[PDB]
Design a binder for this molecule. Sequence first.
Ligand SMILES: C=C1CO[C@H]([C@@](NC(=O)[C@H](C(=O)O)c2ccc(O)cc2)(OC)C(=O)O)N=C1C(=O)O
Ligand SMILES: C=C1CO[C@H]([C@@](NC(=O)[C@H](C(=O)O)c2ccc(O)cc2)(OC)C(=O)O)N=C1C(=O)O
Ligand SMILES: C=C1CO[C@H]([C@@](NC(=O)[C@H](C(=O)O)c2ccc(O)cc2)(OC)C(=O)O)N=C1C(=O)O
Ligand SMILES: C=C1CO[C@H]([C@@](NC(=O)[C@H](C(=O)O)c2ccc(O)cc2)(OC)C(=O)O)N=C1C(=O)O
Lengths: 266, 266, 266, 266
Amino acid sequence: EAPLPQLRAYTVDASWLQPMAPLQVADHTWQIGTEDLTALLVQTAEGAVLLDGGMPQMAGHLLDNMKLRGVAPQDLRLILLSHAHADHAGPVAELKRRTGAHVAANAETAVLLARGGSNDLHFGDGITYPPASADRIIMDGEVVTVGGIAFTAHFMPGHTPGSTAWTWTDTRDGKPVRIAYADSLSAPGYQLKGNPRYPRLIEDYKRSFATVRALPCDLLLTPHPGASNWNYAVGSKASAEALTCNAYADAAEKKFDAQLARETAG
Amino acid sequence: EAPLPQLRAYTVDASWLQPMAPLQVADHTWQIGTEDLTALLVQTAEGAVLLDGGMPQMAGHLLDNMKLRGVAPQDLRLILLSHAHADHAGPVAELKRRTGAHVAANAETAVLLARGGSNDLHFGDGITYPPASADRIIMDGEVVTVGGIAFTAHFMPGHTPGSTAWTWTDTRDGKPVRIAYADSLSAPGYQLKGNPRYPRLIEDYKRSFATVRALPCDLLLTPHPGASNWNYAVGSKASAEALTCNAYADAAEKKFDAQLARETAG
Amino acid sequence: EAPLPQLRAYTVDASWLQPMAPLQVADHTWQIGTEDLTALLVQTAEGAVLLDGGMPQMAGHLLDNMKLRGVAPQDLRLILLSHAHADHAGPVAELKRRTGAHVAANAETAVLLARGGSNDLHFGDGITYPPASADRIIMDGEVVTVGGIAFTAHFMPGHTPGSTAWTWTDTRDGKPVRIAYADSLSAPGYQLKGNPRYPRLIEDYKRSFATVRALPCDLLLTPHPGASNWNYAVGSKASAEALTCNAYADAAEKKFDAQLARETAG
Amino acid sequence: EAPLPQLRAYTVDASWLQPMAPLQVADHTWQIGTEDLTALLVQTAEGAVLLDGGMPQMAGHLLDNMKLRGVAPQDLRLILLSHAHADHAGPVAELKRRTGAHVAANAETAVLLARGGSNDLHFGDGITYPPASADRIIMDGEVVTVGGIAFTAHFMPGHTPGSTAWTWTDTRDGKPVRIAYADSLSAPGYQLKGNPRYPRLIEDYKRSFATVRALPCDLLLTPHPGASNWNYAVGSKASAEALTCNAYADAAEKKFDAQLARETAG
Ligand SMILES: C=C1CO[C@H]([C@@](NC(=O)[C@H](C(=O)O)c2ccc(O)cc2)(OC)C(=O)O)N=C1C(=O)O
Ligand SMILES: C=C1CO[C@H]([C@@](NC(=O)[C@H](C(=O)O)c2ccc(O)cc2)(OC)C(=O)O)N=C1C(=O)O
Ligand SMILES: C=C1CO[C@H]([C@@](NC(=O)[C@H](C(=O)O)c2ccc(O)cc2)(OC)C(=O)O)N=C1C(=O)O
Ligand SMILES: C=C1CO[C@H]([C@@](NC(=O)[C@H](C(=O)O)c2ccc(O)cc2)(OC)C(=O)O)N=C1C(=O)O
């Protein structure tokens, strides 16, 4: 008699777990994650903000890179998230324990984070990670400010119900740089039509494409750098091929429409 | 450059995942888990009680065995736990979703369950499982009653801070049978002395040995059947070699004392 | 020197706390709350559903009326909510403890319920009540079914971010009766414009008026019966003057637009 | 027909709500609460610790007094609690929101805090306050360190299951001062014998008297200053009549034994 199957680990491509040194994006904004997972550190006069953390096992690397930037663990004030899947919110619980940082997130992201990604609308229990609590619930368009730097939330539901873009204005060469950290717009293996767990999925994606098109943006970044044509491994050329918000939304919508037709076709 | 390691699944011996048909323990009490993980179903006139559920992937098997016993999913009223590690509380979240059952547990077990076993005092994040909430917090000696059957909690901290023995009186051949479901008394790989996360660990274990010795008991069962010398695979002979509470406590204390001396010896 | 002020209780009009006997709305749907707070009991072959519970002190009255309807406490399967303010979700924690019912709610309602209505977007801590957990998170358009009766969620944010209308089809005289339990559309004392805690408040209300207009509805009910021109105290004439969904939405939008202009005017 | 009663506010003696300026207890420890509720600020080189906060409406006063001491809101690192009743943990949720501080507490205190004091073992829902989450769960004897100052937890269950004494060593006149902040040992209106919600209440109190007697202590403080014969209103004479730990435990045990006999006598 076959025994029940063993639990299966959430395994990812090696490049998602490949550490990199901090890569400067603008005067106060640094990529400090891995070659293929974004984790943005924004350094202010009154502490630092982290946008996403990658996989659960990246906690120590993130703290190492923070130290290279002059940021002690207790200097991390705030953690913001694109969406609460294991490869973007993975280390949040550990980071909170080791830094004292607060998490700000919308209600959808908060409830998914608090159950550690279990009972996912599409992935079941296959991508569970250590649960964490949100300390501040934010609404669409709400502004969170640290050290004078204002981060604005733009809800873009679809990839998860709580998917969020974050925008802020940094500087470079004395000129403002409007940064938009837009969430994933993929639907990998999702049932798009008539999904009982997400009945308005298609309507939400369509609205989210429009939301991304309209973001204030001189420089777009995404949780997976490849989704916006970044290449973190090539240093000062990393942003050279980066997409605009319009191009990112267009590419995602074309992919979505094609997937929708293939779902209709089996 | 080495990438960070992949996440590692919590894997167990195949016998822990080997389904078995329901095995009657007393007039209303059945073992419905696997060959090497206990999951007790107590069937009352007003619904059923489940004591432990085993590993996360056992949820469907438990519901199958409940159906064989005449217990529909919605007939499950209450889930009780020995301790909230992944191989005993694994399927609790799914069972709650599929049955509507409530969970009753002490505060220590409730907080560990709510973080899905993450940030374990000894095991870190290596044995995380889907988090679940406790619907009723119980105190030491508190009585929980379903369908007239009274279950009494006996706290026995050590293996986890929330480790609990549950006792109830069933029947067999018209005579009462005092059942004691006592938790694990092992300390596998634990730092026993001067543990900053559990400073009174040794004192708690020593008290818990005494608590187990004094339990009202005609028939002892344990989360791992082998710990009390049960053999679920041999049917009506399964209980033949079962230990008394005194023998179980004595064996565990001898093992603990020897481990303590080996820790002193490196 | 003045001491700090005493805590102030959330007090309501006496009619909101005036018990009434069950009032039949359709073949399986009964008003079982007070003269001026709605609490709907829907009785199915496989248990009962409660939609809202009123104030915290109404828990015992609700159970009394359930018993008059033939519904024992353990027969209550599911609690649904319009929104998680103290005068509609007040007794949910106690009801869960005494009945074993599960709560299904969207993420916004779940987070507000879990903090007992504290840190309200508009009311601060003035309307706190005992916190409760949601056992099932639902999405817009999701169907929850008990005993074959399907309840559909329609999100209508504004009064709270989690405000929800629930629809189901009952019967009367052998004909179907599409019931719509639509949430409040009031904004009592709210700052509508440029509210930092709810930046898209006006956009959400405007969308919610349209959502209410389009609900499937032969019979509209509301958390406050007066909002839809019900009068629970007059028995079989209670529904005589009830508004349509279109009239309810129109009246609320006219009131909102007038309030918006008065806010512009001070 | 009588309507259901209105909700009743938790009202306290005016002196419990009477603000006072900071009163120095030792080189780094200050009383910053009210005349009759203790709230201790311990100031370190790496941030401040708050032990208790008093009533919910004291949040602003506490922040005012912190500012007088040179402690900005974001300088508050850690909140510790004696027990999670409304008059000691009242403002914790607001303080967390306004300061970013973490809360460390044992599991019993954490679960009571997370339900805002509702469903109290003895007081029902009469003393509910805004819920808050614990960020770190601590065990008996565990050491929490901020800025080099070590705070040790001593569990003393009875008044609440999670009641805790905290000890640390400060200085004065170049000599060490062992401070013990011991919790309440009262049982106001409690059913002591055969309490189904707290079956081992008497055993826990008796053990807690012994725990308090054995605390390392040169200077005892208590959540209610009068319980240890402090008088915060008389400035530099405030500690003159303060009890020893032995005298505090003796007085509480005599009161408990007398109450136990009166309960036996009706
Ligand atoms: C395009 C992808 C696909 O890879 C990840 C994803 N998926 C996976 O990593 C991968 C997969 O989709 O094949 C997966 C592996 C194992 C699982 O159990 C579930 C999903 O993360 C959960 C996902 O969100 O779909 N994320 C994105 C993304 O856009 O964020
Ligand atoms: C005696 C044991 C050992 O096996 C399990 C245990 N441990 C393991 O299954 C096993 C181990 O201890 O070697 C383990 C595997 C992987 C891990 O990441 C952690 C622990 O479950 C978590 C444990 O509690 O120690 N449980 C018991 C028990 O008495 O309950
Ligand atoms: C129209 C109202 C006004 O009365 C209640 C309400 N408000 C009050 O009961 C009342 C008020 O608005 O004056 C109130 C009393 C005390 C408070 O601390 C806050 C509000 O409940 C919280 C509210 O949601 O605004 N609810 C509605 C409603 O539409 O649901
Ligand atoms: C000795 C007392 C009595 O006063 C408070 C207490 N009680 C009250 O303030 C008071 C009372 O006991 O009479 C009370 C008022 C209103 C209530 O709903 C409940 C209790 O706080 C909840 C309590 O813990 O018993 N606390 C202590 C104490 O030792 O901490």
